[PDB]
């Protein structure tokens, strides 16, 4: 909600309180999304100041407060800063920002990350260019310097992040994306390559000294209709765990497909149908193994712009004999969202 706007500076303080619950049989250990209370809340700010006609500065921070922990020792479980960056936009020259933000490849995966509760399975966090990462400098150009309506691109420089964990670490890398949007249609290509750290390399699964990820996307967004499709692949970048051996590392190779179809009724009901499948290839020891594979049926109902509720149903296609131990049960999510 825009709580401030004077002297060319507008601050938008936003947040949401999400009562959420997952239903999966068993202890949800073998299900797709787990089971039980998953209530959480968000608080963030978006600032933007007009330094003059052509120049605009801006910043953004968003935090995630888990609402399903006790007031005991576990209170902070899952709490984190999702985004934190500052930047400048200049006329038709482009924008530049630095901090914790979205890797460029997500310019592609963003297409199908529209399910009510699940979806976007491939957009992992602290996983190079696919989701939110720390220390990224991103330059974005829109309408090709104002010369070509609808043609945008971006280049991104990822700074090395040597964390205590191979999963949350990365070496230096560069990525870019080019997208074009013409009247309801949108197409995108995104790609990035980076150095893997010593620790990532010391891992049991995955072999290389460079991590790659690229995805293409296609969408039709108009007339209350939303259809979107993504296809991407990766090399030594996707994190995987052998539940049997308790081994971990990265998939040597993966091929990922994501399809989504939705319709927004004028009365507020937005049904959703989706399909996701991500399969790993050449996993040292297993061979080919599915990591994600399901159908999604779900719906969201918007009471207005501040209140909504939804049910998300995952019809897990993963089979019980999956070699990595990936869960095979279904999961149903019911949620009620207040937001401002």
Ligand X SMILES: CCCCCCCCOCCOCCOCCOCCO
296-315 residues near ligand X, rule: CB under 6 A: none
Q: Determine which residue in the list 98, 180, 231, 338 makes contact with ligand X, applying CB under 6 A.
A: 98
State the minimum distance, in angstroms, from the CB of residue 326 to ligand X: 26
Q: Determine which residue in the list 34, 93, 95, 125 makes contact with a second copy, applying CB under 8 A.
A: 125
Classify each residue of 69-95 as buried b or exposed e, where b means 16 or more C-beta atoms within 10 Å of its C-beta: beeeeeeeeeeeebbbbebebeeeebb
State the minimum distance, in angstroms, from the CB of residue 23 to ligand X: 8
Residue number with CB closer to a second copy (84 or 273): 84
Q: Determine which residue in the list 141, 142, 161, 264 makes contact with a second copy, applying CB under 8 A.
A: 161
Note whether 162 binds ligand X by CB under 6 A: no
Chain Cα centroid distance, residue 229: 15
Note whether 34 binds a second copy by CB under 8 A: no
State the minimum distance, in angstroms, from the CB of residue 51 to a second copy: 4
236 CB neighbour count, 10 Å cutoff: 24
Which does residue 172 touch among ligand X, a second copy, none (CB within 5 to 8 A, set by kind)? ligand X
Instruction: Report the site for ligand X in 164-183 (rule: CB under 6 A).
Output: 172-174
Note whether 224 binds a second copy by CB under 8 A: no
Classify each residue of 33-67 as buried b or exposed e, where b means 16 or more C-beta atoms within 10 Å of its C-beta: bbbeebbbbeebbbbbeeeeeeebebbbbbbeebe
Note whether 159 binds ligand X by CB under 6 A: yes
Residue number with CB closer to a second copy (4 or 185): 4
Distance between CA atoms of residues 82 and 42, nearest Å: 10
103 CB neighbour count, 10 Å cutoff: 30
Question: Kind of pairing, strands 225-235 and 210-222?
Answer: antiparallel
Residue number with CB closer to a second copy (89 or 235): 89
With CA atoms as reference, report the closest residue to 63 among 45, 87, 86, 38. 45
Instruction: Report the site for a second copy in 304-333 (rule: CB under 8 A).
Output: 304-307
Q: After which residues is the chain broken (C to N over 2.5 A)?
A: none
Residue number with CB closer to a second copy (58 or 231): 58
Note whether 15 binds a second copy by CB under 8 A: yes
33 contacts 115 by C-beta, under 8 angstroms = no
325 CB neighbour count, 10 Å cutoff: 15
Chain residues in the site for ligand X (CB under 6 A):
19, 21, 98, 137, 157-159, 172-174, 334, 336
């Amino acid at each position: 909600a825009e709580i401030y706007n004077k002297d060319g500076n507008k601050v938008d303080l936003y947040g949401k309180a999400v009562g959420l619950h997952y239903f999966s049989k068993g202890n949800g250990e073998n299900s797709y999304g787990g089971n039980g209370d998953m209530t959480y809340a968000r608080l963030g700010f978006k600032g933007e100041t007009q330094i003059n006609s052509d120049l605009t500065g801006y910043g953004q921070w968003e935090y995630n407060f888990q609402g399903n922990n006790s007031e005991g020792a576990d209170a902070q479980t899952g709490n984190k800063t999702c985004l934190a960056f500052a930047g400048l936009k200049y006329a038709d020259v482009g924008s530049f920002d630095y901090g914790r933000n979205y890797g460029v490849v997500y310019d592609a995966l963003g297409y199908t990350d529209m399910l009510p509760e699940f979806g976007g399975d491939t957009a992992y966090s602290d996983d190079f260019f696919v989701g939110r990462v720390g220390g990224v400098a991103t330059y974005r150009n829109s309408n090709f310097f104002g010369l070509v309506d609808g043609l945008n691109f971006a280049v991104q420089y990822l700074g090395k992040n040597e964390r205590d964990t191979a999963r949350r670490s990365n070496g230096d890398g560069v990525g870019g994306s080019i997208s074009y949007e013409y009247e309801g249609f949108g197409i995108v290509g995104a790609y990035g390559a980076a150095d893997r750290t010593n620790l990532q390399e010391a891992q049991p699964l995955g072999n290389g000294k460079k991590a790659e990820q690229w995805a293409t996307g296609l969408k039709y967004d108009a007339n209350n209709i939303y259809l979107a499709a993504n296809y991407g692949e990766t090399r030594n970048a996707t994190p995987i765990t052998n539940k049997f051996t308790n081994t971990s590392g990265f998939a040597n190779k993966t091929q990922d497909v994501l399809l989504v179809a939705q319709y927004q009724f004028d009365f507020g009901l937005r049904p959703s149908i989706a399909y996701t499948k991500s399969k790993a290839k050449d996993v040292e020891g297993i061979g080919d193994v599915d990591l994600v594979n399901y159908f999604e049926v779900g719906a969201t109902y918007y009471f207005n712009k501040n209140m909504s509720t939804y049910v998300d149903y995952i019809i897990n296609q993963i089979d019980s004999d999956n070699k990595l131990g990936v869960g095979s049960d279904d999961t149903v999510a019911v949620g009620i969202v207040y937001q401002f």
